[PDB]
Amino acid sequence: HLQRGCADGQSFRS
Amino acid sequence: SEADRQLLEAAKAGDVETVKKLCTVQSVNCRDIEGRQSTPLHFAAGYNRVSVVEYLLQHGADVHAKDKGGLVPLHNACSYGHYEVAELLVKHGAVVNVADLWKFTPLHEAAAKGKYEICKLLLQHGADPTKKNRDGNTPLDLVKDGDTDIQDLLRGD
């Protein structure tokens, strides 16, 4: 689902 | 507006003092038009900025607000494994069975990303492991082969 993209954010603060 | 850009950037960065300076009744729920319309709370949730999440919630951020793709901040928290943020959002009334434009729920996100404790949290608050997204896939369907613990959790067996 390329149109879906991804949520703003990331798992590691580093 | 420049102000809204700065606020969104501060939320992303976890810059609490700048959020405090720029957060107004008019900006607390602004949207990142040039991106995917994330709100300050989406950014704080996704980037695990706990203090900012708390402040924004206290000052009237909408836990239910959907971005351009239908994600609410709980999706962002769950997809990136931010347990404390997820619990703050749920405690403040977040709907656990919320679905984006593709019928992905936060449980779909946590399952696919291998986040056991977040899956368990969602389940304790009534998340439905049988909900299919537009692909006809449940959260269980999206679990990696290696995560047999999450599989067992979602199956209830």
Q: Show me where the domains of chain B are located.
A: 1-157
Chains A & B: contacts with CB separation below 8 Å: 49
Contacts of A4 in chain B (CB under 8 A): 69, 100-102, 104
What is B18-82 written as a DSSP string? HHHHH--TTTTT---TTTT---HHHHHHHTT-HHHHHHHHHTT--TT---TTS--HHHHHHHTT-
Cα separation of B120 and B11, whole Å? 27
Query: Which of B18, B84, B94, B96 shows the shortest CA–CA distance to B54?
Result: B84
Cα separation of B145 and A14, whole Å? 27
| Technique used by the depositors | X-ray
Q: Which value in Å is the resolution of this experimental model?
A: 1.7
What region does B62 belong to: left with phi over 0, alpha with psi -120 to 50, or beta?
beta
**Residue B110 CA: distances (Å) to CA of B69, B83, B133, B153:** 17, 10, 14, 12
Using a CB cutoff of 8 Å and minimum separation of 24, what contacts does B70-73 make? B70/B99, B70/B100, B70/B101, B70/B102, B71/A7, B71/B36, B71/B42, B71/B100, B72/B42, B72/B98, B72/B100, B72/B106, B73/B39, B73/B41, B73/B42, B73/B44, B73/B45, B73/B46
C-alpha distance from A2 to closest chain B C-alpha (Å): 11
The token duo for B79 is 């997809």
Which residue has tokens 């619990």? B87
Contacts of A11 in chain B (CB under 8 A): 80-82, 113
Which residue has tokens 């347990």? B83
Cα separation of B145 and B142, whole Å? 9
- The structural architecture, per CATH, of the domain B1-157 is Alpha Horseshoe (1.25)
Secondary structure of residue B97 in the 3-state scheme: coil
C-alpha distance from B110 to closest chain A C-alpha (Å): 12
Cα separation of B104 and B16, whole Å? 31
DSSP state of B137: -
